[PDB]
């Protein structure tokens, strides 16, 4: 208790605006802050929240001492904004909320999703199925099997081509699964192209 905060994750399109609200319980509170924390490093200040309500700059934070809540508004989202946001209230000795994660998702112009098969250097062959390109709506999840490891999607940016694309990876000991029956337990697109030879 003491300090509650927007729970589950905000997953929004790059350009949307986002709203965070935090409610404290003690009226005596003296100062209020919004902190930003990339995963998984350190809380770096973001906003000092004042009763006067803020102005600059793209970000906006206000205090409502009466209703005992502070707010944060991020207009015109950006990938970089993707983090966990922290409510801090100086209740005599400063309380920290457990924060709300924001994952700004980029838009893929031409989504031609696929699942290729990279082969190990050195030797052994092993196996890695690469799911990449797909649009930010596609959502990747675990596998029914435990010996098949699956990583959550991951955005990638080639600076000198302003080209960004999503990416997800899954692997398992030569059991021997293929890159066609990989993410069987996830909701893949209807146009996923599978190369075999």
């Amino acid at each position: 208790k003491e300090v509650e905060q927007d729970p589950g994750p905000f997953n929004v399109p790059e350009g949307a605006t986002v709203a965070f609200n935090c409610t404290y319980s003690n009226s005596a509170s003296q100062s209020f802050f919004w902190y930003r924390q990339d995963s998984r490093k350190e809380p770096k200040l973001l906003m000092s929240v004042y009763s006067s309500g803020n102005e600059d700059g793209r970000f906006t934070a206000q205090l409502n001492r009466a209703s005992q809540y502070i707010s944060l508004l991020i207009r015109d989202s950006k990938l970089s904004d993707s983090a966990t946001y922290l409510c801090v209230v100086r209740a005599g000795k400063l309380i920290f909320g457990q924060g709300t994660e924001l994952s700004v998702k980029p838009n893929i112009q031409n989504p031609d999703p696929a699942v290729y098969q990279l082969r190990d250097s050195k030797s052994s062959d092993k196996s890695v199925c690469l799911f990449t390109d797909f649009d930010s709506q596609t959502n990747v999840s675990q596998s029914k099997d435990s010996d098949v490891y699956i990583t959550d999607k991951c955005v990638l940016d080639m600076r000198s081509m302003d080209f960004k694309s999503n990416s997800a990876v899954a692997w398992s000991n030569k059991s021997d699964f293929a890159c066609a029956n990989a993410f069987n337990n996830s909701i893949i697109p209807e146009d996923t192209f599978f190369p075999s030879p």
Partner: protein
Amino acid sequence: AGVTQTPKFRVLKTGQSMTLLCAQDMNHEYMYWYRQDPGMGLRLIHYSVGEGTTAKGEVPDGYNVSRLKKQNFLLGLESAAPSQTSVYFCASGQGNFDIQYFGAGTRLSVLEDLKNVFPPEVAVFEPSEAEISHTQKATLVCLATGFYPDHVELSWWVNGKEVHSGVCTDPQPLKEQPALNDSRYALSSRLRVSATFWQNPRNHFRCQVQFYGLSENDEWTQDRAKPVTQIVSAEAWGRAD
């Protein structure tokens, strides 16, 4: 400039002691030691406000603190044990409990037995040609399996140069035995360049993974090779192939 904190990573056997340094180049009067765990904000352990000061938050267990000098706040554990294994941050404040400037952090793992500390196997998988003859761009994937704890730092190196342009690493390490309290960890990364740039054979690609395990004078008996702060890497040259 800056509020500096060290060490960045560490491992201790139950009972062994250590000390964390918070240094502040900012001539601030207020300093803090927080503990950070999942499912709960930070938590105060101690805080000094001058040169002889201490106090509150949640001091037990073995958390003592010192502030001989103003530039430095020293937190110390005398008989480490699990719990106590988490991630420590420290902050400097020019106000009272005002704006707080934190430090990079300290991820400490306390194990009552050093046996289950393992280094990472690093594998660089090469770009499936399909990708090239379709997307005309290459993607070098990199894995890191069977390591504990998750104390690692992964990077790519194109011809003597670390690169970030065109990369994406899992923000969080994966668990191989998700239902075990001490699971072996695994981590993936990605690197992508223009297809033409892949064929070029003068091009060299390297996946450098910093591990962070045992120290020098640590009692190692296990058959296997003492899991110490090291670097493991995997390579792949340019294939006109």
